Amino acid sequence: PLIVPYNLPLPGGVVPRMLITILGTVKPNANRIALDFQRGNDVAFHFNPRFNENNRRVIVCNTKLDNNWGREERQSVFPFESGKPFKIQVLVEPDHFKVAVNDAHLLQYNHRVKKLNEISKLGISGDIDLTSASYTMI
Ligand SMILES: Cc1ccc(S[C@@H]2O[C@H](CO)[C@H](O)[C@H](n3cc(-c4cc(F)cc(F)c4)nn3)[C@H]2O)cc1
Numbered sequence: 001p002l003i004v005p006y007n008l009p010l011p012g013g014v015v016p017r018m019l020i021t022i023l024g025t026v027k028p029n030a031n032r033i034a035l036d037f038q039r040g041n042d043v044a045f046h047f048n049p050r051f052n053e054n055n056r057r058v059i060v061c062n063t064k065l066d067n068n069w070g071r072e073e074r075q076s077v078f079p080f081e082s083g084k085p086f087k088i089q090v091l092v093e094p095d096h097f098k099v100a101v102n103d104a105h106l107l108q109y110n111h112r113v114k115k116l117n118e119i120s121k122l123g124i125s126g127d128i129d130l131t132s133a134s135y136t137m138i
Pocket residue numbers: 032033034046048060061062069070072125126127
């Protein structure tokens with residue numbers, strides 16, 4: 001419904017207690033999805049389900065600084081399914097992003113980019129139909 005790739009501005013950046021909720025449906029035969037919490041050209045937090053990396057499904061998380069990707073953090077718990085609706089909740093906590101999918105905790109990503117108020121947009125890309133993307137304070 002929303003056009004992908006989608007940019008969700010995060011006015012004034014992120015802050016602890018800010019909850020981002022993404023609702024969508026994975027396309028049939030999906031290959032990849034990405035969320036990119038961006039600080040200008042840098043990617044503070046890239047969250048990247050890969051449906052077929054050497055015949056394995058894996059979530060890759062990383063940070064991009066000055067156009068260079070850093071050390072990957074990988075999670076083989078893989079809650080996405082081709083053709084199926086999902087909910088991603090990203091809660092900003094003081095020391096990490098905390099991600100739950102379909103109401104089940106999935107992973108945490110420690111803040112590498114520490115200027116949280118400069119992480120002022122979220123990109124949503126890849127092989128989904130995007131239903132909604134929003135934020136609220138909890
Ligand atoms: C030295 C080296 C060699 C290979 C790599 S591979 C690289 O790995 C990164 C995480 O370390 C990112 O995942 C990166 N990436 C994915 C997407 C992307 C994903 C979507 F689902 C949709 C879309 F539109 C774009 N954009 N950039 C990938 O190219 C990295 C370093």
